Symmetry: C2
Subunit: 107 residues, 2 copies
Protein backbone atom coordinates (compact mmCIF):
# COMPACT_ATOMS: atom_id res chain seq x y z
CA UNK A 1 0.00 0.00 0.00
CA UNK A 2 2.93 2.31 0.71
CA UNK A 3 5.82 0.29 -0.73
CA UNK A 4 4.77 -2.16 -3.46
CA UNK A 5 3.10 -0.20 -6.24
CA UNK A 6 2.12 -0.91 -9.85
CA UNK A 7 2.64 2.29 -11.82
CA UNK A 8 1.78 1.25 -15.35
CA UNK A 9 1.27 -1.75 -17.62
CA UNK A 10 1.24 -2.35 -21.38
CA UNK A 11 -2.02 -4.32 -21.36
CA UNK A 12 -4.86 -4.99 -18.97
CA UNK A 13 -6.45 -7.96 -20.71
CA UNK A 14 -5.31 -11.17 -22.31
CA UNK A 15 -6.07 -14.77 -23.20
CA UNK A 16 -7.50 -17.10 -20.57
CA UNK A 17 -4.79 -19.53 -21.74
CA UNK A 18 -2.10 -17.22 -20.38
CA UNK A 19 1.21 -16.65 -22.10
CA UNK A 20 0.78 -12.94 -22.89
CA UNK A 21 3.77 -10.68 -22.34
CA UNK A 22 3.21 -7.94 -19.79
CA UNK A 23 5.49 -4.98 -19.17
CA UNK A 24 4.87 -3.73 -15.63
CA UNK A 25 6.52 -0.56 -14.30
CA UNK A 26 6.68 -0.44 -10.50
CA UNK A 27 8.36 1.21 -7.55
CA UNK A 28 11.66 -0.31 -6.39
CA UNK A 29 11.53 -4.07 -5.77
CA UNK A 30 14.08 -6.85 -5.15
CA UNK A 31 14.37 -9.32 -8.03
CA UNK A 32 14.85 -12.25 -5.64
CA UNK A 33 11.84 -11.28 -3.54
CA UNK A 34 8.99 -10.25 -5.82
CA UNK A 35 6.17 -11.86 -7.77
CA UNK A 36 3.04 -10.94 -9.72
CA UNK A 37 0.00 -12.47 -8.07
CA UNK A 38 -3.32 -13.05 -9.87
CA UNK A 39 -6.45 -13.75 -7.84
CA UNK A 40 -10.17 -14.39 -8.10
CA UNK A 41 -12.75 -16.25 -5.98
CA UNK A 42 -10.94 -19.37 -4.78
CA UNK A 43 -8.23 -19.00 -7.42
CA UNK A 44 -4.64 -17.79 -7.32
CA UNK A 45 -1.77 -17.91 -9.83
CA UNK A 46 1.55 -16.22 -10.51
CA UNK A 47 3.10 -14.53 -13.53
CA UNK A 48 6.06 -16.35 -15.05
CA UNK A 49 9.43 -14.57 -15.18
CA UNK A 50 13.08 -14.94 -14.20
CA UNK A 51 15.13 -12.66 -11.97
CA UNK A 52 16.73 -11.47 -15.21
CA UNK A 53 13.34 -10.14 -16.31
CA UNK A 54 13.35 -7.56 -13.51
CA UNK A 55 14.82 -4.39 -15.03
CA UNK A 56 16.78 -2.08 -12.73
CA UNK A 57 14.45 -2.99 -9.85
CA UNK A 58 11.58 -0.95 -11.30
CA UNK A 59 10.06 -2.98 -14.14
CA UNK A 60 9.11 -6.59 -14.70
CA UNK A 61 8.46 -8.29 -18.03
CA UNK A 62 6.52 -11.48 -17.41
CA UNK A 63 4.06 -13.91 -18.98
CA UNK A 64 0.53 -14.19 -17.67
CA UNK A 65 -0.52 -17.41 -15.99
CA UNK A 66 -3.41 -19.38 -17.51
CA UNK A 67 -6.79 -18.62 -15.94
CA UNK A 68 -8.61 -21.28 -13.90
CA UNK A 69 -11.01 -21.95 -16.79
CA UNK A 70 -9.82 -22.39 -20.43
CA UNK A 71 -13.42 -22.77 -21.59
CA UNK A 72 -14.21 -19.22 -20.48
CA UNK A 73 -17.17 -18.09 -22.64
CA UNK A 74 -17.22 -14.41 -21.70
CA UNK A 75 -14.52 -12.04 -20.36
CA UNK A 76 -13.80 -12.20 -16.61
CA UNK A 77 -12.16 -9.60 -14.42
CA UNK A 78 -9.56 -10.69 -11.88
CA UNK A 79 -7.05 -8.92 -9.65
CA UNK A 80 -3.34 -8.52 -10.29
CA UNK A 81 -0.91 -7.48 -7.56
CA UNK A 82 2.77 -7.34 -6.77
CA UNK A 83 3.53 -9.70 -3.88
CA UNK A 84 6.66 -9.81 -1.73
CA UNK A 85 7.16 -13.37 -0.36
CA UNK A 86 9.54 -12.36 2.44
CA UNK A 87 6.93 -10.35 4.36
CA UNK A 88 3.82 -11.11 2.29
CA UNK A 89 3.43 -7.43 1.43
CA UNK A 90 0.96 -6.78 -1.41
CA UNK A 91 0.41 -3.80 -3.71
CA UNK A 92 -3.05 -2.37 -4.28
CA UNK A 93 -4.86 -4.58 -6.84
CA UNK A 94 -5.09 -3.75 -10.54
CA UNK A 95 -7.83 -5.15 -12.72
CA UNK A 96 -6.88 -7.68 -15.40
CA UNK A 97 -9.43 -9.14 -17.80
CA UNK A 98 -9.13 -12.68 -19.08
CA UNK A 99 -10.67 -13.23 -22.50
CA UNK A 100 -12.10 -16.26 -24.29
CA UNK A 101 -9.61 -18.03 -26.53
CA UNK A 102 -9.45 -21.29 -28.46
CA UNK A 103 -6.65 -23.84 -28.75
CA UNK A 104 -7.23 -25.98 -31.83
CA UNK A 105 -5.19 -28.71 -30.13
CA UNK A 106 -7.44 -28.77 -27.06
CA UNK A 107 -11.05 -29.88 -27.47
CA UNK B 1 29.40 11.22 -20.62
CA UNK B 2 27.95 7.71 -20.33
CA UNK B 3 26.15 6.00 -23.22
CA UNK B 4 22.58 5.40 -24.37
CA UNK B 5 21.34 1.82 -24.55
CA UNK B 6 18.04 0.20 -25.53
CA UNK B 7 17.65 -2.97 -23.44
CA UNK B 8 14.21 -4.35 -24.31
CA UNK B 9 11.06 -3.35 -26.13
CA UNK B 10 7.50 -4.69 -26.30
CA UNK B 11 7.32 -4.58 -30.10
CA UNK B 12 9.56 -3.97 -33.10
CA UNK B 13 6.89 -3.02 -35.63
CA UNK B 14 3.71 -1.03 -35.95
CA UNK B 15 1.30 0.74 -38.27
CA UNK B 16 2.58 3.33 -40.71
CA UNK B 17 -0.19 5.57 -39.31
CA UNK B 18 1.73 5.69 -36.03
CA UNK B 19 0.10 5.79 -32.63
CA UNK B 20 1.32 2.45 -31.27
CA UNK B 21 2.45 2.39 -27.66
CA UNK B 22 6.05 1.26 -27.15
CA UNK B 23 7.61 0.31 -23.80
CA UNK B 24 11.36 0.79 -23.98
CA UNK B 25 13.60 -0.34 -21.12
CA UNK B 26 16.96 1.42 -21.14
CA UNK B 27 20.04 2.30 -19.16
CA UNK B 28 19.81 5.42 -16.96
CA UNK B 29 18.61 8.50 -18.85
CA UNK B 30 17.51 12.00 -17.80
CA UNK B 31 13.82 12.65 -18.48
CA UNK B 32 14.61 16.27 -19.33
CA UNK B 33 17.23 15.37 -21.97
CA UNK B 34 15.98 12.32 -23.86
CA UNK B 35 14.11 11.57 -27.08
CA UNK B 36 13.38 8.53 -29.19
CA UNK B 37 14.06 8.94 -32.92
CA UNK B 38 12.90 6.94 -35.94
CA UNK B 39 15.01 7.40 -39.03
CA UNK B 40 15.01 6.13 -42.58
CA UNK B 41 16.25 7.44 -45.95
CA UNK B 42 14.69 10.90 -46.30
CA UNK B 43 12.64 10.62 -43.12
CA UNK B 44 12.96 11.25 -39.41
CA UNK B 45 10.44 11.64 -36.59
CA UNK B 46 10.36 11.42 -32.81
CA UNK B 47 8.41 9.13 -30.53
CA UNK B 48 5.74 11.07 -28.65
CA UNK B 49 5.99 11.27 -24.84
CA UNK B 50 6.27 13.67 -21.92
CA UNK B 51 8.71 13.70 -19.03
CA UNK B 52 6.08 11.91 -16.91
CA UNK B 53 6.38 8.94 -19.27
CA UNK B 54 10.01 8.34 -18.29
CA UNK B 55 9.83 5.84 -15.44
CA UNK B 56 12.59 6.06 -12.84
CA UNK B 57 15.15 7.02 -15.52
CA UNK B 58 15.19 3.50 -16.96
CA UNK B 59 12.03 3.11 -19.04
CA UNK B 60 10.13 5.23 -21.53
CA UNK B 61 6.57 4.64 -22.70
CA UNK B 62 5.80 6.52 -25.92
CA UNK B 63 3.72 6.56 -29.09
CA UNK B 64 5.24 5.92 -32.49
CA UNK B 65 5.10 8.79 -34.98
CA UNK B 66 3.26 8.42 -38.29
CA UNK B 67 5.54 7.25 -41.09
CA UNK B 68 6.10 9.33 -44.26
CA UNK B 69 3.72 7.08 -46.21
CA UNK B 70 0.29 6.47 -44.62
CA UNK B 71 -0.59 3.93 -47.30
CA UNK B 72 2.19 1.35 -47.13
CA UNK B 73 1.82 -1.71 -49.38
CA UNK B 74 4.70 -3.60 -47.77
CA UNK B 75 6.91 -3.26 -44.68
CA UNK B 76 9.59 -0.58 -44.50
CA UNK B 77 12.61 -0.73 -42.24
CA UNK B 78 13.70 2.24 -40.16
CA UNK B 79 15.93 2.60 -37.14
CA UNK B 80 14.79 3.46 -33.64
CA UNK B 81 17.36 5.04 -31.32
CA UNK B 82 17.61 6.92 -28.04
CA UNK B 83 18.93 10.47 -28.59
CA UNK B 84 20.03 13.18 -26.16
CA UNK B 85 19.14 16.61 -27.64
CA UNK B 86 21.75 18.51 -25.63
CA UNK B 87 24.78 17.00 -27.38
CA UNK B 88 22.96 14.84 -29.95
CA UNK B 89 24.33 11.54 -28.61
CA UNK B 90 22.67 8.40 -30.01
CA UNK B 91 22.21 4.80 -28.92
CA UNK B 92 22.96 1.78 -31.11
CA UNK B 93 20.01 1.48 -33.54
CA UNK B 94 17.25 -1.11 -33.29
CA UNK B 95 15.41 -2.23 -36.39
CA UNK B 96 11.78 -1.14 -36.42
CA UNK B 97 9.36 -1.97 -39.25
CA UNK B 98 6.43 0.22 -40.24
CA UNK B 99 3.61 -1.86 -41.68
CA UNK B 100 0.54 -1.43 -43.90
CA UNK B 101 -2.43 -0.38 -41.75
CA UNK B 102 -5.41 -1.57 -43.83
Amino acid sequence: TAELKICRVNRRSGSCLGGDEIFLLCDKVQKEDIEVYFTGPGWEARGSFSQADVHRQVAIVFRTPPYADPSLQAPVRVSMQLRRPSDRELSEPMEFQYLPDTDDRHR
